[PDB]
Write a protein that binds this DNA or RNA. Sequence first.
DNA 1: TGGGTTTTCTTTTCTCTTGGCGGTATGCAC
RNA 2: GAAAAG
DNA 3: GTGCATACCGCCAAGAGAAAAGAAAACCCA
Lengths: 997, 309
Amino acid sequence: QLSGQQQRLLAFFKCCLLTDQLPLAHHLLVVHHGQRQKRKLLTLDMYNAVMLGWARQGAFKELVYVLFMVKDAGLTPDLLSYAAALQCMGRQDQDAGTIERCLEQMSQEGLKLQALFTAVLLSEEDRATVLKAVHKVKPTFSLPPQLPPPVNTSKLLRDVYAKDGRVSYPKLHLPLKTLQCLFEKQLHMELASRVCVVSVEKPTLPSKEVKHARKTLKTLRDQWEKALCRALRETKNRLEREVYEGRFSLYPFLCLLDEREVVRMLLQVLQALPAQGESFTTLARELSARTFSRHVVQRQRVSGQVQALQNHYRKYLCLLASDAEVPEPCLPRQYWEELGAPEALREQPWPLPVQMELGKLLAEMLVQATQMPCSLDKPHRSSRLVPVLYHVYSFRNVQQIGILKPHPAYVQLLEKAAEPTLTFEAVDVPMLCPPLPWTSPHSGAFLLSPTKLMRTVEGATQHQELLETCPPTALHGALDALTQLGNCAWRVNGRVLDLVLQLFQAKGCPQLGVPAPPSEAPQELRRELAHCQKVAREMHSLRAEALYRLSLAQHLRDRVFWLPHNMDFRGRTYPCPPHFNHLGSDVARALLEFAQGRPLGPHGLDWLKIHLVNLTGLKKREPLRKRLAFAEEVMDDILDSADQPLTGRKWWMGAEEPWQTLACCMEVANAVRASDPAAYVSHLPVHQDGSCNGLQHYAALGRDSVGAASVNLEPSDVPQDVYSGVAAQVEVFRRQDAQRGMRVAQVLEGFITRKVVKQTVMTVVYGVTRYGGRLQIEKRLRELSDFPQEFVWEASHYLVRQVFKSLQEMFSGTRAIQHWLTESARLISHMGSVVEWVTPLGVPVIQPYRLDSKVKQIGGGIQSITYTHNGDISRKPNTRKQKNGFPPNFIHSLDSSHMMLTALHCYRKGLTFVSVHDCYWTHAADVSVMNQVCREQFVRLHSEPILQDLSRFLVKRFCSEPQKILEASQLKETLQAVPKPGAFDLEQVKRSTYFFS
Amino acid sequence: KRYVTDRRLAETLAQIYLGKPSRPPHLLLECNPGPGILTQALLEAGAKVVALESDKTFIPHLESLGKNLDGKLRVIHCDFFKLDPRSGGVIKPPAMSSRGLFKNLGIEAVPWTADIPLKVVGMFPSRGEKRALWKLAYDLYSCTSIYKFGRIEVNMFIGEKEFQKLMADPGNPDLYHVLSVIWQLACEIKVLHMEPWSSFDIYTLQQKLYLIQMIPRQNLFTKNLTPMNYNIFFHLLKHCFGRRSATVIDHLRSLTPLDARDILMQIGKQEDEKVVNMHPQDFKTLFETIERSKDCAYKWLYDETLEDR
DNA sequence: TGGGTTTTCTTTTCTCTTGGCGGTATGCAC
RNA sequence: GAAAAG
DNA sequence: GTGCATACCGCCAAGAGAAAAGAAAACCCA
Ligand SMILES: Nc1ncnc2c1ncn2[C@@H]1O[C@H](COP(=O)(O)OP(=O)(O)OP(=O)(O)O)[C@@H](O)[C@H]1O
Ligand SMILES: [Mg+2]
């Protein structure tokens, strides 16, 4: 592959084209060309960048020189070089003889002019000026007409993308003009790139000390602003002078943004530093990402694509508007592409070392540039300028990491000032408008900010390569499901927010999930003070997390907002805003409801009652009629919880999910007291959850008859749970061991419940060790208050031994399929290639697990950073991690496929569908329709030979190259050794009441 | 596991642990008596010997010899590195608290200025020598575990590779690091014997094991240096030795808001003073001169949040 | 064949070891 | 050092 | 033509910070 210095120089040239510093890039070109030993690094793209730049300027004088440099270097001109030549001849309006001669040279060169136009990435302005250049030579040249957009014709996605049948597509309850206004609001919010929200803490009394603290912080911030401006100017002059003496600098990378914007960004990251401090590499990553995002937004602002996206979005909103009717109903992506689609300039991100040195330089600039007086606590004494941030080495085992900890007087001034505002990025806030439809892995969730289709912890990763080398119609289902999940309009439950604010502003209630303030922390004998500081710091961390969450919830109290959605590498869907979403804690799910409601209908109140009994955590093993009768028995408690949440009998606090139970009690209380229960418009999301859903999929692929009955794939009157069966086996083993007088059984007694055994039984069907189950049950025993805490370790070992003894001779097909997946992953990862597979909806999935962690040490003023070069510099795959990842990753990919099929086929029936993982939420009116569609999509997904098609795909891709056959023949034995299905008529899943419940 | 099983100079080590003849019969907490020959040689001296053992597989020999010596050998099953175990509730018979030891033996706590009440002999682990040095150093600076009961001398075998790593001074720039300064301020190492690998028959590239006789020093704790703020001093040492080529100014600009030039002017060391050329006593008095500064309030930036991030 | 190392998978809040010396290749002064 | 979701 | 200065890279180190209280099993390394 390309060298690191080659990548850095190419990024330098490309940034010069963006910053209009074409004279500077030509200077490095002639410096690196006039001398020999570094000229072996220059490639064709490096010359074509400056070629295209001089083309946009219409300068023949330098372009002929660069062409002479290309000819002298010994490398042949490519398509983009002649495209740049045609561009520069077309821009200058010069006569037809030269364009005729050069296009004759193009024809003599033999490469197609249509290949210059098509399948090679150019801007539309470049295409237009090449068209203007060619129209003087050949006025009879015409580009091929635009083909109609292709339609995905896969069997799972053939009911969708079908012109026949009646479709009742959902429409938002907002009109067209209000949606356009919210688009304007979100466009302004993303242009500003930051959001300021009011804190939910009670405001401090504005005394003299508070105002003097605020004035001191203000004058320090002004001094830091001026100092950072001076430091940034000195750095840019040093980089410009360092460039002039022939070295690759970062100079165009710091002129991408304005000086004020960079200084303000550094001040913002300085403001949001925790008192403990952050890693230097973390600050480098975050600073580089913020700079890249602001570069993208600024480039789209200057280039004029904001107005194009605006004019296209006002036309696109007519499909989803209540009062606007399209001539033919279709999906949001299909309507986005049916109109004139604006061109999305694919902006290549910076290389990982370039990002690292940019963030490292900006972090070092923040550390050196900011000065403070001697101590902010009592600053009246004579002051030496000490740094605001300190670079302290923090030590964990042999490892030594650099941490930028703020000075404690700066910290003390920060909590003494009591700043009433909090600042978020525009990416970290829920969108105010419907998101852009997912039309490509590039054009995605947000209006202007770049957003990945697949979340990746690593910087440069091969996921987008599979997302772009796929067939164009392969990703249509996943992108449409992402658009559908992002199109759900959310609304904050104000009453639950009022009660959580009541508990948060006062002394918190940790029983209900509201963090207590650290000022109420409790205060041999010498160890107790350190223990109290540890407890106070834990409550400091959790309350700060809640401070972000409830502030962002208060910011969205009276506005309809949207949660844009992404995937991971194996397909599971997450909302992009991290703080306030529906995948969070019980409080966060309680605050959220649907912004559009449905009338309950003849059997909608029953679903609300069943959902409430499910949220109580009681009557879990009981049938639906028993849950409904139980809800009728506790009706007075339901009304007392709804009417008097904190001043009543407090029935809702005893529920397993208390705040969700309280919100559902309020919904049932308003529904029953209505005059017509069927006519009550309900906005509460009712949840249907899978019972052992990984085991449900294992029994679906295995076609077993015993495990499928255990995980409710066979119809039954009562629900079936394997967790309670294992719990009963462990409890009778505990009774036998307590009979013998063993101490651990006497300590445990009745403490073995479903919850302590649930995650381990859930996990044993993946490649878990006994150490993982040990920690799994040790955490569950540690969170129990009534358990004696000196017995946690030995009871954990005993309980793990009885749990793994209990699962013997159980789930035979599941263990067979998991062993086959683990064996196949081990034989793939023993070779060089990592494990790849294609989902039944067509999504390619690869695992980013590689052994080599390159040091990639970068010298600098403060220290040398250590980052793993993730852009395939790591080569050897991590065999153990591939083995331990593949059996869960496949099952979760099939989870994603089932979820996307259910969403896409509930969209055609007019159902609002959102999904936590194996938890499908819809309106209480249409729970039965969602259940029926979920069962049919489960049948259609699992009527496909997923194991057999996986085996044929794996043999076709990873077992067909000749040079590996002698080593892969055993793998050819493994891949074609899938277990037999057996006898289980899977159509009975359509009659299973307790499939999802 | 390394075990002493040779009669060579066993009487010589016995005369080493005799000390002054006028002393009373002095308790010897021998650690891991595997073969029991060294315990027999120690019992030939006539003083009381208490065996602390991790090898319960061959347990009856020690107590069987103990009843023959009329109860002088009070054998109690315990491993020395495992006293006061780490976040553990249920006390197993291998690992037990020091209060259990000292309540069984009747011997009690004394003030730090008092005389030595007790002697320990035993092994370091074959590989975990550095970690066990850190356990004993943490128990010595924070006067807990054994060292709560007094100024407990402990005499054991040390590896050759880590010996001069503990005896290093200003000089030997390759091997001079934190544990040297941490121990040598309160340790009093004197090498008693220099035996090679041949006599040490491990029970089932020569390594020469030296007897280092750790004694806590009386003048360890001051007004500034306390058993509370010893982690701050430990962090000073490891931060200063993180960059060995750097100077004291470079590390103390990151360690304290105090001007390091003024602190070095007070201590008497120049501004060009490098970390590897500074005395172990100078580290302690550097900590004491930073600690006694009364004009400022925030004197250090170390806090337990620096354990992670 | 005996011993070091990690231990089911993501996502997020609060989120990667650094340094120093020697070994080798290459350009420059004489 | 902790917490939350599947 | 020969020797010296400079840049880049592999490696193994310790404050491998303790916790070596504690379980033991497979995968990889010497
Ligand atoms: N800790 C985990 N590790 C791996 N996969 C998990 C984990 N928690 C959940 N999952 C995945 O999520 C699904 C299980 O989610 P869920 O919490 O509903 O559990 P469950 O086994 O269905 O139990 P329940 O019936 O109590 O809801 C499966 O697809 C499983 O693979
Ligand atoms: Mg479930």
